[PDB]
Amino acid sequence: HMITLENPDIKYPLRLIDKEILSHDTRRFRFALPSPQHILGLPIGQHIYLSTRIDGNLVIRPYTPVSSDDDKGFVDLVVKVYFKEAGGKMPQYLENMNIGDTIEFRGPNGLLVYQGKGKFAIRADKKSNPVVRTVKSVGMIAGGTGITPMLQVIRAVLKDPNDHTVCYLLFANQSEKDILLRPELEELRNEHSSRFKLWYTVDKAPDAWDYSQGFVNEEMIRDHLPPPGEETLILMCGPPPMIQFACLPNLERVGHPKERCFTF
Amino acid sequence: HMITLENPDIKYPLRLIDKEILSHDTRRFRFALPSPQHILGLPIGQHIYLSTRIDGNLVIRPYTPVSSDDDKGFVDLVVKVYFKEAGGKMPQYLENMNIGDTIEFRGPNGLLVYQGKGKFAIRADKKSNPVVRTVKSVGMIAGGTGITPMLQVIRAVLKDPNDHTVCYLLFANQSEKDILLRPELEELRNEHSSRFKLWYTVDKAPDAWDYSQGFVNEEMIRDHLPPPGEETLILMCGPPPMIQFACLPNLERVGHPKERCFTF
Numbered sequence: 001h002m003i004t005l006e007n008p009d010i011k012y013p014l015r016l017i018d019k020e021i022l023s024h025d026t027r028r029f030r031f032a033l034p035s036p037q038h039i040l041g042l043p044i045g046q047h048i049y050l051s052t053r054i055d056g057n058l059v060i061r062p063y064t065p066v067s068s069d070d071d072k073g074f075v076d077l078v079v080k081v082y083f084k085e086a087g088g089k090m091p092q093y094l095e096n097m098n099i100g101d102t103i104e105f106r107g108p109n110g111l112l113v114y115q116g117k118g119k120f121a122i123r124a125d126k127k128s129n130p131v132v133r134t135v136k137s138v139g140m141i142a143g144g145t146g147i148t149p150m151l152q153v154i155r156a157v158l159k160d161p162n163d164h165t166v167c168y169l170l171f172a173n174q175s176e177k178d179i180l181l182r183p184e185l186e187e188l189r190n191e192h193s194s195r196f197k198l199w200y201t202v203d204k205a206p207d208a209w210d211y212s213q214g215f216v217n218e219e220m221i222r223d224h225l226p227p228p229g230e231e232t233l234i235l236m237c238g239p240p241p242m243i244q245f246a247c248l249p250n251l252e253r254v255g256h257p258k259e260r261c262f263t264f
Numbered sequence: 265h266m267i268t269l270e271n272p273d274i275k276y277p278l279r280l281i282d283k284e285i286l287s288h289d290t291r292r293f294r295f296a297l298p299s300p301q302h303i304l305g306l307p308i309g310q311h312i313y314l315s316t317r318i319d320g321n322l323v324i325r326p327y328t329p330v331s332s333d334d335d336k337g338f339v340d341l342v343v344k345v346y347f348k349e350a351g352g353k354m355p356q357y358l359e360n361m362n363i364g365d366t367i368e369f370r371g372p373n374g375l376l377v378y379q380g381k382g383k384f385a386i387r388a389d390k391k392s393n394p395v396v397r398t399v400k401s402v403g404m405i406a407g408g409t410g411i412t413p414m415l416q417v418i419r420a421v422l423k424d425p426n427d428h429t430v431c432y433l434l435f436a437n438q439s440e441k442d443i444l445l446r447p448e449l450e451e452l453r454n455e456h457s458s459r460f461k462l463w464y465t466v467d468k469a470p471d472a473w474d475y476s477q478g479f480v481n482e483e484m485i486r487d488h489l490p491p492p493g494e495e496t497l498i499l500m501c502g503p504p505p506m507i508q509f510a511c512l513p514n515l516e517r518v519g520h521p522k523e524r525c526f527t528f
């Protein structure tokens with residue numbers, strides 16, 4: 001394997017090769033890897049950082065590519081750009097990049113690594129040896145672009161026909177139009193209904209809505225995520241308030257132990 | 265070492281980051297390696313190829329960077345562009361590149377590798393194991409840009425305070441103004457007069473000229489290159505006619521055996 005991210009401390013300027021508008025505020029930003037034969041080299045569960053100086057300050061933000069190490073030659077980021085009404089500087093930077101412009105990628109980073117077959121290696125910190133535990137059910141609470149760390153895991157699980165792990169995604173977004181990667185998710189769900197449960201909640205639901213509405217709550221966690229247990233791991237990725245006010249307290253009320261919860 | 269050229273079959277698009285006019289027809293074309301920490305990974309004696317499609321045809325040409333693996337982050341090519349009277353498509357392509365444009369580099373390539381300490385490993389072909397031989401004297405006949413493969417070796421030798429190899433360069437150019445990298449060469453010669461002998465010949469000499477004039481001939485080879493012998497290797501890099509009509513027959517008349525001559 002020609003690995004792009006050979007050194008986690010290296011900032012690899014990768015050229016933007018295409019920008020694709022996916023929705024009113026999200027897009028696919030594809031960057032060329034060092035050669036068409038390269039793969040990113042991003043363990044499942046980890047992310048990369050984009051960094052560049054914006055208005056004189058180094059801006060470094062995490063992104064979990066929606067591409068995988070099966071993809072050669074490019075890395076695909078699904079990025080939400082924040083159109084007004086904290087800064088969204090990096091997405092805006094990406095938004096303003098012209099094709100061929102470079103931005104620095106670094107990685108892999110992340111305290112959690114899905115080793116496959118339900119095995120998650122989670123490090124207390126960068127310097128700690130991961131605690132490896134095998135679970136059978138991975139609950140995933142994603143808010144908006146927090147879907148990418150989840151999708152990376154889901155896809156890893158699902159592409160392994162021998163991975164019996166069942167992923168339960170509770171995907172929260174502002175509105176139906178904001179359900180990022182819905183087609184991707186639903187196809188995964190349609191094709192792997194046994195190992196992938198999918199549920200949505202939107203802050204504002206359309207008049208006709210078959211899913212949940214509102215911030216994630218206990219009921220959604222209790223009913224759309226696996227129950228607390230030694231074989232359950234809950235993963236979370238979403239806005240800080242989502243984590244702090246919609247996830248943590250309800251996971252607690254549902255009974256999910258902090259140690260069987262991981263937040264990207 | 266973060267090696268750029270990890271795979272010889274890979275075409276690494278490197279961004280042009282600097283274009284520097286060196287003379288009326290030569291330039292430094294500096295390309296960024298994958299990261300500022302990368303080195304090219306180019307064994308001494310070898311070259312890289314630049315390749316890109318020019319007017320619908322793949323154009324792949326050899327270049328020996330004047331940078332070395334001591335240089336991190338960039339590769340420096342000294343390239344002669346061919347202006348008004350051969351095809352020079354690649355140099356013209358480079359000439360026409362805008363900063364940030366990429367061109368594909370591949371390598372290392374070359375049947376000769378200087379292993380240091382007078383040791384040259386020369387392969388009959390890419391599939392043959394190199395014949396390693398230690399010489400004490402390396403005669404070098406370079407015509408124009410053919411100086412780069414020589415300079416790479418000269419610098420490698422001179423860089424090593426324990427390399428006793430003496431390099432004798434017979435550098436041919438069309439005119440004094442065409443003596444590519446003269447300042448570099450003369451500084452090397454000035455600082456390592458013991459292991460670096462330098463002689464020039466120019467097709468057309470200026471009114472005041474202390475060196476040779478005309479195509480390389482027997483006398484120049486006899487008197488400015490080490491004598492034929494088991495401890496002598498003659499390297500050549502120049503235009504085909506220089507090789508065929510000024511080098512080979514005179515090397516032969518001087519007595520340098522084909523096996524102790526190598527043409528880049």
Ligand SMILES: Cc1cc2nc3c(=O)[nH]c(=O)nc-3n(C[C@H](O)[C@H](O)[C@H](O)COP(=O)(O)OP(=O)(O)OC[C@@H]3O[C@@H](n4cnc5c(N)ncnc54)[C@H](O)[C@@H]3O)c2cc1C
Nearest residue numbers: 327328343344407408409410412436437438502503505506
């Ligand atoms: C391994 C390799 C690496 C290379 N690296 C580079 C590089 O770094 N940069 C780059 O620009 N190119 C590079 N080249 C291209 C190569 O250096 C040039 O093709 C050729 O070697 C020299 O070109 P020129 O125009 O510089 O020569 P000129 O300037 O034409 O001339 C040198 C000529 O050599 C002799 N000569 C020329 N024509 C004749 C003739 N008809 N009869 C007799 N003697 C003659 C003369 O002494 C004269 O001064 C490389 C090629 C190889 C194979």
Ligand SMILES: Cc1cc2nc3c(=O)[nH]c(=O)nc-3n(C[C@H](O)[C@H](O)[C@H](O)COP(=O)(O)OP(=O)(O)OC[C@H]3O[C@@H](n4cnc5c(N)ncnc54)[C@H](O)[C@@H]3O)c2cc1C
Nearest residue numbers: 063064079080143144145146148172173174238239241242
């Ligand atoms: C490891 C990592 C990887 C990342 N990868 C990417 C990536 O690939 N692409 C990218 O664009 N970003 C990425 N990010 C940024 C991250 O996805 C977004 O910062 C973060 O999780 C939320 O985005 P959001 O704007 O989409 O939330 P919004 O759309 O604001 O919202 C989403 C949802 O979460 C809940 N929520 C929001 N606000 C509140 C509140 N006040 N109270 C309660 N619940 C609330 C709601 O359910 C809401 O629908 C990453 C971040 C990390 C840490």
